[PDB]
């Protein structure tokens, strides 16, 4: 038995968070949940939310409405990695059918320091900050996720030919970890090369690491091949073993209290969360059960979209998860 | 300065042309041959460009471009960077020419089947102020600062170009691309730069969009886009992606405009140094570059009869080049387009 | 006719009081519109300029003391004092450094001038953190305003009939920074041939000011070099307060004390010397087309200092400020 | 018993008065070795950026060195000599004291000031950046360590030289973040050094009061740019750069003692120069090493020759020669 800090959130957030705790009860998931809210106060977070994760080290997060809350949890535990595994979904028909790639998105440094400077009356300068530190760390974490997930090839997206000092140092430490971890295959490829190759044949890709700016854009892009943020898992990792497994889609307030949602992403954020703590067997019975419910093509919800209610899509998974 | 007027002596406009490195020359000769069969009153001023002596001679090679306000070029291999001091051969030209706007035209091809169909997009971006910042000093070791720059002035000049493009062409939607949600001031400046001109063309609907969701929106329903515009940093993304949607680098015409000067370049900047004189290279982009080069000389009648041809030859499966998934050779394509090219208006 | 007085902080108000009485004792027809204050204890005007500008938009002339600066206690993205200067475009700052017959410092019979930029330069409050304990600041210096202060430096030499200017610089390490500035000087200096011109390193210039300052007549420099050499020349004469100051933005004219304040005394006990503002306010009336009152006030202040009878702790004596202000109005009465 | 010092006689009058100093040292029975080296900037594996190694390993062992004046650069591209000396030896602390001279008619008396100047992180670092056309921006950076570093040294000097107070010079009111973090560490050092009084005056305010009355100060501390100008400022009170000594402290016990005055090639080798400026930098070396008994003797006879006024160099207005000046000081350090 293990405890997880959970948060309901806005919109369908609570309506889908309980659809997960009901299927994890049906999956025999050794999880006792722990419900905290996190609404911004004063700036910082609720202290009863601040404590809840300092002990649990894991957490499932949902849709949040509108400084940013995603910036707060970032620096609250020094979230230094935004991970996003995008995988093809048989049944869900998208013109990209053979996809299986995990975007690693460094989340600390880059131009996301917000540091801008008016220089004269009409000249604005935004700062891109890059340290050796946050690079070598997102370099080791990438190799540890590749090893601990049977991943074949790890590519470091960059434009070091251009920013010969900025992206060059990023790449310099990308290689230094590769010799000290020749375990997994390692190669490089220019951003624009990846951007073209991504829309021609994504299959040739496997694992990708990049600095923050390229990461935020590549993350939502790679997801766009499979269907959108509603089917996209998401996992942020921070210092001292803390980890967050959010969804990324919008709150969708127009049908929040309607049971007209698709939570599967939040589930695969938990199936991701399951797989982070070594729950392969219990994440293998949940993941393939949700795959088969969509692959059957009967209980899909409206943004997919068939004709059912979020509970029906939730009830069929509970019927297909009670079996092995 | 001492600059004269570019003039057109009795018919033939005199256009500057640069062969380049790799695939450049072997294509240009077909573009010549295509024209020469099409009886196009455009004479060509060859100028050997670079990778042979990129020191001071090319510069005497700038002059020909500064003369005739319109040039067409292939590509130049990147400098070894041994100098490692800017010196982008291609870039230098667009600097000393004040070529601020960079324009590509990703259109779907009825003969080139892709994951998505019915696509028509015009992309706009700057060059010397659209971020893409150099500089990057090391404050202390292990710490590097990069300095993306927005200028309000060049932001409106590229903005006005985005809308002067839409009205003359009968477009309907300009869509800004930005990350103002992260760099509130830099990209918000560009955003309010767009909003100012957006009110001067009220007939043209205006919309903004975050660079993130915009990329997602392309691979799903790209037909919604009509005209897109961003600073030069986000372009490399949107360009190469919109390039691969309708095919590959060898299918996208390109163009770098100045306040007066106008240069035509391919949508994809690929040297092709590995496909040297293989009779393989896809011409369909380079040809399309000549198409809009004729459209800029206000000779549409020939750019239209050329354009309908190259779409025409491409639709038969056999003419595709290897780089897009075919089995044919350029010589067959060029001639098949020439076949497709009938004697409109000659003998 | 109508003028706005911004006392600022320090003894500035105590000094404004001395002028108000000296004005009422010299039949000076200026209805002061001094209204409260700008920042400091008051806090941000804010937009004091809005309050401030509207008065300047109408009066077109004013006179303040010194803000004296806050040392970043507040949010303080940038120093407030520059911003009013920016909102009013007071790009030029003029410091009359004229040794006086009464005061006998270690250097006598001197008559120079400090021309100073106030908008470009490091006085922008621009900074940020790169890492843990690694801060980075930006000196801004652009061609547009560098010309205007370079332009400002030279037309001053013609209308007053001066001899030579000397552009101050440390471009030998900031090749791009003071090099751009120094070029805009040598660019303009070509246009003024009847004017001898020099360039001098800052540290080398400052050391010559303490060896032989009689060598150079007019000086022009960016913002940081200004505030440095400002308090230097004023200190050499005797006190920051005795030397006055002038700052012209657009068509507006602004006068104030030369130096920021006599820092060491830091006194509100009325011990402070008002000569500075008075000489600046006199030079103000000289601008107000009322040269008589400007001339007669300067005459009385000079001779009174030349009397050696009435002096304050800065000038070797011990007199109250309103004692001196009264003897000022005393020699003003008989004249 | 004896010690080694790497001597760099330099250009112009330098070697002439460098041997004049080596004579007065033997005339006062000074146990010091002289390892003559030239240090002219040699070209490295790509440009112009390294030194004669023969002078390097000497300093890496001698730890102490005396440098005289040096000339300009052969081409515009060549870098400043004292910059590589800074970066090749980590000379963070830049020392320049100023004491009034009893036999000099300067209109400033009874001063005894020492400047502590920061030497690497700062405006002097070559980083600048052009933004757009006609828009130039310089780079000033300050770090926690080197600020804490220049701090912990300056307090030790006052602890080591029987000094009383210490003033921190800055303009943190205006460049709040930079000078402030400099200042917040300046404060944090006096917290463990309560034996030395400490205060802070604004830089513009220091200049003003430094002009009127200078004696109201002891030792001063500031970052690099303020130093290189306030040091030259304070130099004028002590007779200028030519008659004022200097010091540079590198890591691993490496120290450097130099004069800042020019090399003077329009009077070079004519036996006219005034060696007293660098001669005192040698005395600063004797003070940092430990020969105060030998340092107090020379600084006394050095003052006595100037105080008598019988012999003076032409830069001091006199009609005596460098040899006439060196010999009267030599015959004085003997009478002790």
Numbering used by the authors:
A (entry chain G): 4 to 45, 51 to 74, 81 to 338
B (entry chain H): 4 to 348, 350 to 351
C (entry chain F): 15 to 349
D (entry chain E): 3 to 338
Any passages from the paper?
The structure of the (αMβαMγ)2 holoenzyme belongs to space group C2221 and each asymmetric unit contains two (αMβαMγ)2 heterooctamers. The overall structure of the (αMβαMγ)2 holoenzyme is similar to that of the WT (αβαγ)2 holoenzyme. Intriguingly, when one heterotetramer of the two structures is superposed, the other heterotetramer of the mutant holoenzyme shows approximately 20° rotation relative to that of the WT holoenzyme. Moreover, in the mutant (αMβαMγ)2 structure, the active site and the allosteric site of the αγ heterodimer, the active site and the pseudo-allosteric site of the αβ heterodimer, and the αβ-αγ interface appear to assume active conformations. In particular, the N-terminal regions of the α7 helices in all of the α, β, and γ subunits assume helical conformations similar to that in the active αMgγMg+CIT structure. In addition, the sidechains of Tyr126A and Tyr137B in the αMβ heterodimer adopt active conformations; and while the sidechain of Tyr136G in the αMγ heterodimer is not clearly defined in the electron density map, the sidechain of Tyr126A also adopts active conformation. In other words, the α-Q139A mutation induces conformational changes of the clasp domains of the α subunits and the αβ-αγ interface and subsequently the active sites, the allosteric sites, and the pseudo-allosteric sites, which mimic the conformational changes induced by the binding of activators at the allosteric site, rendering the mutant holoenzyme to adopt the active conformation. Nevertheless, as the resolution of the (αMβαMγ)2 structure is low, we could not perform detailed structural analysis of the αβ-αγ interface and compare it with that in the inactive WT (αβαγ)2 structure. Moreover, the size-exclusion chromatography–multiangle light scattering (SEC-MALS) analysis shows that similar to the WT holoenzyme, the mutant holoenzyme displays an average mass of approximately 290 kDa at both low concentration (1 mg/ml) and high concentration (10 mg/ml) corresponding to an (αMβαMγ)2 heterooctamer.
It consists of three types of subunits (α, β, and γ) and exists and functions as the (αβαγ)2 heterooctamer. In this work, we report the crystal structures of the αβ and αγ heterodimers and the (αβαγ)2 heterooctamer containing an α-Q139A mutation in the clasp domain, which renders all the heterodimers and the heterooctamer constitutively active in the absence of activators.
